[PDB]
Design an enzyme around this catalytic site. Structure first.
Site, short mmCIF file in Angstrom:
data_model
loop_
_atom_site.label_atom_id
_atom_site.label_comp_id
_atom_site.label_asym_id
_atom_site.label_seq_id
_atom_site.Cartn_x
_atom_site.Cartn_y
_atom_site.Cartn_z
N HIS A 43 0.82 -1.21 0.00
CA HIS A 43 0.00 0.00 0.00
C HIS A 43 0.84 1.23 0.00
O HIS A 43 0.31 2.33 -0.16
CB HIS A 43 -1.02 0.05 1.14
CG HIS A 43 -0.43 0.33 2.49
ND1 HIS A 43 -0.46 -0.58 3.52
CD2 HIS A 43 0.23 1.41 2.96
CE1 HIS A 43 0.17 -0.08 4.57
NE2 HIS A 43 0.60 1.12 4.25
N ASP A 99 -0.49 -7.58 1.69
CA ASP A 99 0.01 -6.23 1.52
C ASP A 99 1.51 -6.26 1.74
O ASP A 99 2.04 -5.80 2.77
CB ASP A 99 -0.64 -5.33 2.55
CG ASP A 99 -0.25 -3.92 2.41
OD1 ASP A 99 0.28 -3.56 1.36
OD2 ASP A 99 -0.46 -3.16 3.35
N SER A 197 4.09 2.70 8.50
CA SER A 197 3.65 1.72 7.50
C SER A 197 4.82 1.13 6.75
O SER A 197 5.80 1.83 6.50
CB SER A 197 2.71 2.36 6.51
OG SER A 197 1.46 1.71 6.54
#
Lengths: 247, 29, 6
Positions: A43, A99, A197
């Site tokens: 992502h 992901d 992230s």
């Protein structure tokens, strides 16, 4: 990282900063798994809902750093990418399933006292180490609140059990994700937040003295919310695909 | 097999400020 | 589909 503290320099070597070329900008975390390969969350590269889609010629990586801004000239290594491999079944439309992404380095890396890979999980390690209550660790330069550290941060969080993770969200959770965090009654805090992230969730193995990368920071419903946990990509399980790209 | 072992820590035989923390949870309760 | 990106 929400509710963490500064890290001791030399704490997390496998800690890459996923930066953007122009205007310079941090996008995520990633990690060093070799001297040419970097692991991150998909992502961070492709997330259509926000018009986000990066090419090899859009990024850089500042491998081996401590101060998020002051480019530490004679200890840090910037590099361009050769390729970007994003899992072909990465569900960005629904639950962020699988992901994961592997970033190739233009040319190898000179490992240093502040640069070196993190071990991938093998069947044996995974089996003994992935148990609820068992704490792993997250590092990152992202927000310390749902606002950003001057130095790398650390928080050590417990793996929550499969049923409790699923009871907290309404997102279809898959085999490929696990969650970590403190439950409401523990009066202990911590979480990853914007920009952490793609960062790594590592656990140390007692048998040898090695750190394994158990999961990749993926998503969460806020940062350090009561009764909400943070979701991480289950590296071990997507390791089959990892072998496929690095081969 | 040179992965996992931190030069400034593992290879030097030094423990980080909060490593202890993770090891407890292993032998927990 | 929060994507912990920044």
């Amino acid at each position: 990282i929400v509710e963490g503290q500064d890290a001791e320099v030399g704490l997390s070597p496998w800690q890459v900063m996923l930066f953007r070329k122009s205007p310079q900008e941090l996008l995520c975390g990633a990690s060093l798994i070799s001297d040419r390969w970097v692991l991150t969350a998909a992502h961070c590269l492709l997330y259509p809902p926000w018009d986000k889609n990066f090419t090899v010629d859009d990024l850089l990586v500042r491998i081996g750093k401590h101060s998020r801004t002051r480019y530490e000239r004679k200890v840090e290594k910037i590099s361009m990418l050769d390729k970007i491999y994003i899992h072909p079944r990465y569900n960005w439309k629904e639950n962020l399933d699988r992901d994961i992404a592997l970033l190739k380095l233009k040319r190898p890396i000179e490992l240093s006292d502040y640069i070196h890979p993190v071990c991938l999980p093998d069947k044996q390690t995974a089996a003994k180490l992935l148990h609820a209550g068992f704490k792993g660790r997250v590092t990152g330069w992202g927000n310390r609140r749902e606002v950003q550290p001057s130095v790398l941060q650390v928080v050590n969080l417990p793996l929550v059990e499969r049923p409790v993770c699923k009871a907290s969200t309404r997102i279809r959770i898959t085999d490929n994700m696990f969650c970590a965090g403190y439950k409401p009654g523990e009066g202990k805090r911590g979480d990853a937040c914007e920009g952490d992230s793609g960062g790594p969730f590592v656990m140390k193995s007692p048998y040898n003295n090695r750190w394994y990368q158990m999961g990749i920071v993926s998503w969460g419903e806020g940062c350090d919310r009561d009764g909400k946990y943070g979701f991480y990509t289950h590296v071990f399980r997507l390791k089959k695909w990892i072998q496929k790209v690095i081969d | 097999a040179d992965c996992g072992l931190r030069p400034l820590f593992e290879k030097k035989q030094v423990q980080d400020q909060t490593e202890k923390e993770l090891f407890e949870s292993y032998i927990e309760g | 589909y929060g994507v912990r990106g920044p």
